[PDB]
Design a protein around this ligand. Structure first.
Ligand SMILES: Nc1ncnc2c1ncn2[C@@H]1O[C@H](COP(=O)(O)OP(=O)(O)O)[C@@H](O)[C@H]1O
Ligand SMILES: Nc1ncnc2c1ncn2[C@@H]1O[C@H](COP(=O)(O)OP(=O)(O)O)[C@@H](O)[C@H]1O
Ligand SMILES: Nc1ncnc2c1ncn2[C@@H]1O[C@H](COP(=O)(O)OP(=O)(O)O)[C@@H](O)[C@H]1O
Ligand SMILES: Nc1ncnc2c1ncn2[C@@H]1O[C@H](COP(=O)(O)OP(=O)(O)O)[C@@H](O)[C@H]1O
Ligand SMILES: Nc1ncnc2c1ncn2[C@@H]1O[C@H](COP(=O)(O)OP(=O)(O)O)[C@@H](O)[C@H]1O
Ligand SMILES: [Mg+2]
Ligand SMILES: [Mg+2]
Ligand SMILES: [Mg+2]
Ligand SMILES: [Mg+2]
Ligand SMILES: [Mg+2]
Lengths: 7, 362, 362, 362, 362, 362, 7, 7, 7, 7
């Protein structure tokens, strides 16, 4: 992801 | 001596002494427990907010119902002895509730007050009517919509109209969850309990109510002029587009989260329809909006528009939504408690002991 | 050939062929539409009940007034072609209505029959008088109280007494809503449309009429002997206390839901008072109770008690409330239609076309 | 002509032609690059597995999100021209995704299809609903838990219930990492990328789900009867004890890896609770488990036990988890594509060009 | 009485009494045996260093794992009776270990303590957390990188975050070996075990961390200004060029020795990413570097630079790396042992005897 | 045109034209100078061998390092103009080296080629990889053990694994010296330089590798069946007993000459261990032995035995050691040079002149 | 709640 | 270690 | 109704 | 070599 978590 | 007012909201705990124009202790109704091993067993309110990254946070209240009595009790403990610094047996207390909460809830609270805290006397009031006192009115419709539960109580010249009270479980926490789902499709992810609180902070700062939702969507599609930036606690930058108003829109269209209920603008209208025609005009001219969700920018204007359409032509729709509407309930409590007439309404421990818990239903 | 009787109640649609002693198609007057996205555009009757969890259910009829003609028409369509399996142009039809419904309603129905369905001939009858035929009487007071609207029609020796017809909008659906509010304070919550139907089911099984409401309340307070268990569709268990009779009590005390009308026992009495003294005795000895709400256990006994108190001493109060009173209207229709005298009363399409809709007021 | 189905999972790439009952090309979604100097610049799928000892392997997909478009594109290239031996412009294609993936991801894929591959028409479907088609049902709860992301989608009589879709990032790769840590304390060490793949192989062969985790732990402590031997590629022998079930246990207790989410048995339950009571029974009787992680021995029985406890008594919990559940998604794709009704849903290049990427959100 | 702290590092054995601010016995963890025939069977520590020219030296510990128990035991023997001059049964002891070492290792040590040495009570602690105590902090990230193994443990407000502990086998001994290979290409040769120790000495004196590795290489190519001279034990002169920083560079680029792991600056970063966003800021402001490899000149500045680039803008990166960081673990031990709270944590022989070796996992 | 391959070994100079299957000029890398007064100033190769009785012979190369550039240059001179009869400026040349030789050595050679010999273009290759080409393999472990230095290079599918290259200075010349010492205790004496060469001749004819060294010793003690006779140049007869295998045994036990290194069978094993587990199997099945010391009878069988013991059970150990393994490096050179792909790798004088000597490190 | 909704 | 790496 | 009550 | 060993 672009925030929270990686991806 | 001086009565102690305590608004047990599902979001914030707002307590302070009667006579003051503002609560003294305002903090989140949260109990947190260490997610990992290691030092307190639990943290409360601002403590929980401070260390939330390593805590599992729970709300003891949901939709105005106390679901976890142990944690509830803990918060009161914390409140009285750590936030206000006062022994509860010294003062009368005023607690509040939302309309139509299960009677067991009400009684259980009372029991605690007369056991754990040994409160001299107490009274439970409807949040809505207190708000009305704060507005300086005896006639109007109180729209209380906070974190926990939205409700609508029509009041006319000092008389209640209980047969037309509306209750809507759609509230601030639902908006929070909905927003999370939206942020997901945007490209972010907020799923932990700590993250929940972050999301809330965003909402409170960047969301607003579109006047014409559809046109606002079109404009958002047209350009980035509505986009804002929000810096996260760790320095990352969130770019938010149409979510800035698509979120709060849910209040007018509950179907977004799968509910069958009509939006709050129709809920209000419906309550009015349930009242005898003779007083509908007076109610139209005195809508009172209060509670945290009514803090969204332009929500009053949107509301006016919506009602105007629903109401008969020429029925002036006047919506009262003053600064500090966020605390109108607490304020109302301050007022009522200071009111000398009201003193006869206190429920004493004496009476409780003799009659039993059923006494509170009066 | 054989006339087709169709009782357009607000609760159930009861249709069947004249001459039979029971309706053949009995199902809820409900039209449901998909709450979420996905397959029919809408579902009707038992279909709606079957899939109600994902449907928004609407009643096309409210208080005996058709509010949604599109849905109304749809139900008739469904009835004739899916439930009875019969082309409407083959048979005379008998429709019913409650007293004092707006004339536009009556005419609109007729229009549809002579356009969409091309009904050979039709007639609209008062539900109350049909009930009387079913009871085998020419004299008495018909108390028709179903889902939609409660009404009371005094009849004497085959003559109508229109100046003393009472109409009371308090009915089964109001009892349903009231019950919901009560279940809330008990500790449950039924707010969705699907939940509404569940509530209804409960009512129909566990509610009864207390003989002496106050003493019954006292007993309920005294112990759990009156408590019952009801298993919900998902396996949860509902425990019900005094709500088992506090709900139906509303029929005798409409003030519970904010109405000014006196209870049905006084409504009946009042109608009697509006009739000339000469026939009051005959009416006292022939009260006829019919319609779904009169199915509550012991309601007849309660009624007798109430009237006995109101009526002059020695005026024997006899209340007739036989098994199958639930369908007495439909039965009456079967009877009347089979009656050969009645054949002259059919309104033919021919007459309609020449005179226009106003013709039905005869 | 014949549509081409391609399941872009995070673990395996499963592609084949619609109408067949099995995928034709099944291989790891891995791109490998030479760790040392020396001959291809990169290797894909089985090539990568074959030479993995000297390669740095990357997964282009993480948690259902494409993170490396260059590598993603490369895999598709490889798939179409090396595994299936077919020019993409000859066939419609069906791609899949997990619920709630960021919209940018979805659109980007589409863009590639209409640029690099010039796909005639395409459609993106939710993996969960495809699985449901494979199960021959229109009602049930699909639990898709593979390598990438676990998710749960409730479906009722052909209608979606989007407001109750759950997403859980806990998946096969997390189990892999957790297992590594456990093997470490046992006395081994698997830290290289190549070693990762070895670990995976072990898991797939020797892990199982304990019925009663605690008792299973006790037994493992009691004796070596549960210990197994696994021979490594270089001939060494791994002796595994309680790790054979302590690993998969994480699915029911995510706290093992620091997550706050409840286990998958509660995730499912929660989704059910979010659905209207009317259909909960039907869902309880139709749980569908699919995806690679549901291949663990006895996981269905464990699941049943867990749900049984959570669900109301008498609510029969039926779990459907047939052989080949591993490919149910792909199968569903085969079915749907062959379905003639579905043909109207293809998104043509024509439409795309005119409307732009936003069109996929439909 | 006074607890005895013993840091069983893979490089140096650091032991001393709690309460002191420095270890009393610090010597190499080496056991040497006569390479040729001739007088002791073996030599330990400084003895081995003194006569190393004729000895085959072995390290009993590798990467934090005890591989040779006989030699390990011997060192402890030597320590207690020759270096500290104290009977072990007189004092509680504190041993340390690196995170994720195989459980058999831990237990075996314990067994020895309760057999060979008859230690009254003992405790095994993580080296990282002890370092944190020495730094006077309750929040931060401990980067312990010594001879044996590099590891990284995030700690927040006195709570552990075990799910984000990193372990990297790259350490001081690997740097040593790498350096040897480099010296070879320079024109020298260090292949014997005795030579190994010489190489180590060089490293500890002449290596430093380049701020910008590439520019430093360019400068080294440009001129001899960076060249230094080192006199060997036999009087020969070693001229060293770019090896003075090319060696330590490996810590940031493990690929130099064939490892797939990212450098330590990314290892740290990754650990941070595995922690919930709420506490990342606090961790960024409190990096703690300790252990012998953090003694290289300018490594902190290099580290800051590296992290600064990886971290979000404005996230102040503060790295704490005080003088004597080399012994921070031992110091931490001194502190903890003197701490009175801690006394409840000692594992007594009594408990051990009753429960068995498994008891240490607590 | 045709490239000229020149293997600058420390023992023999092996040169010839690419494309041929055998070197054309094979002679000792020896420069001899008159020990007494007297006629050339020096003699080279076979000249030196012919008149060695009156010459002091020097090897310009030691352990793969050129120590005497004047003599080295002289040999090349002699080679090109006296042995091959060819002007060096007419052909590309291929030189070889052992892994990890000091970079100054490499560059100095290059300088000479572009000054004294004016070589059009040249390339320096690792002896080990050339051997691999000769074996027809892309995967395996090359064990190059000649006169100068023993080394071990693991190669996998055309990729180098530099981090696991082993170098062992134990080689043919060390075996020679060791043998001398043994012959001394037998009763002979070989101390002059000329005598050295005689010793070498003996070794090459009468030594072999015992399968089970200890049993072989026992047998030698038991009887004279193993004794052989060797006639010296002056007619004397040497009787050799257990020295026929005690000498070569040193390769498996370097401790015989005071080295700390493990034997070559463990050196190989260790290199394998340094490679990622995924490819260890392939390496076990492809050991390639080449270079003059691998010419001892039965050394392959001994090697197999040794490795078999060290390697995990079932890991088939296949050792490839074909006839002519002695020249496999030269052969590899012939192959590589003829390979057309390789032509891009030549280092031209042009490039050298512009970049400087550093260019060779590529 | 004890039915309908959670609370 | 007993696998992966030496220790 | 068109006034008084809904219907 | 220029140290360690001769060469
Ligand atoms: N600026 C704001 N805009 C919108 N909502 C707000 C704002 N500030 C607070 N809130 C919301 O108000 C709710 C709390 O208000 P309150 O009325 O005190 O709740 P409750 O009375 O249920 O405790 C929270 O859901 C919070 O997000
Ligand atoms: N056993 C029962 N007890 C009480 N009410 C009942 C029972 N069965 C049905 N009803 C009620 O009767 C109503 C429907 O009866 P009916 O007289 O046919 O209505 P309508 O004629 O208005 O369609 C509904 O409100 C339903 O709840
Ligand atoms: N026998 C097995 N037991 C357990 N897990 C398995 C088995 N076979 C495969 N898997 C796991 O299934 C996952 C891949 O399954 P799949 O559902 O296709 O993943 P995805 O759909 O995310 O690509 C991998 O994580 C793999 O380890
Ligand atoms: N001045 C120095 N510069 C760099 N490294 C050093 C220095 N002094 C000691 N070291 C290294 O520190 C390591 C030993 O430190 P230590 O942290 O005690 O190791 P361990 O805790 O693993 O025993 C050795 O590898 C040694 O080379
Ligand atoms: N038959 C043989 N048995 C054993 N060793 C031999 C034999 N023939 C030659 N050698 C040895 O091989 C070495 C030369 O082989 P070579 O591999 O060409 O060395 P280099 O490549 O280092 O020049 C010498 O040490 C020589 O004694
Ligand atoms: Mg509130
Ligand atoms: Mg009726
Ligand atoms: Mg999948
Ligand atoms: Mg250390
Ligand atoms: Mg050679």
């Amino acid at each position: 992801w672009x925030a929270x978590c990686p991806a | 001596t001086t009565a102690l007012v305590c608004d047990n909201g599902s979001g914030l705990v707002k307590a302070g002494f009667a006579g003051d124009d503002a609560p003294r202790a305002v903090f989140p109704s949260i109990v947190g427990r260490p997610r990992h091993q290691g030092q307190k067993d639990s943290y409360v309110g601002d403590e929980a907010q401070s260390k939330r990254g390593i805590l599992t946070l729970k709300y003891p209240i949901e939709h105005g119902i106390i679901t976890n009595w142990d944690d509830m009790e803990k918060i009161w403990h914390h409140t009285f002895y750590n936030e206000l610094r006062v022994a509860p047996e010294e003062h009368p207390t005023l607690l509040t509730e939302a309309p139509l909460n299960p009677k067991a809830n009400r009684e259980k609270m009372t029991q605690i007050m007369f056991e754990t805290f040994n409160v001299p006397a107490m009274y439970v009031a409807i949040q809505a009517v207190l708000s009305l006192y704060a507005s300086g009115r005896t006639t109007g419709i109180v729209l209380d919509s906070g974190d926990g539960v939205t409700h609508n109580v029509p009041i006319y010249e000092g008389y209640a109209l209980p047969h037309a009270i509306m209750r809507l479980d759609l509230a601030g926490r639902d908006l929070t969850d909905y927003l999370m789902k939206i942020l997901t499709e945007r490209g972010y992810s907020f799923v932990t309990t700590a993250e929940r609180e972050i999301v809330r902070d965003i909402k409170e700062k960047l969301c607003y109510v579109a006047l014409d939702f559809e046109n606002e969507m079109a404009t958002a599609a047209s350009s980035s002029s509505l986009e804002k930036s929000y810096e996260l606690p760790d320095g990352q930058v969130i770019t938010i587009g149409n979510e800035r108003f698509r979120c709060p829109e849910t209040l007018f269209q509950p179907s977004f989260i799968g509910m069958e209920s009509a939006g709050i603008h129709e809920t209000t209208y419906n309550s009015i329809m349930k009242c005898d025609i003779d007083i509908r005009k007076d109610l139209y001219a005195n809508n009172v909006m209060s509670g945290g969700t009514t803090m969204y920018p332009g929500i009053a204007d949107r509301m006016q528009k919506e009602i105007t359409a629903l109401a008969p032509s020429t029925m002036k729709i006047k919506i009262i939504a003053p600064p500090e509407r966020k605390y109108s309930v607490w304020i109302g409590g301050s007022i009522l408690a200071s009111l000398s007439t009201f003193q006869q309404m206190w429920i004493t421990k004496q009476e409780y002991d003799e009659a039993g818990p059923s006494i509170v239903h009066r």
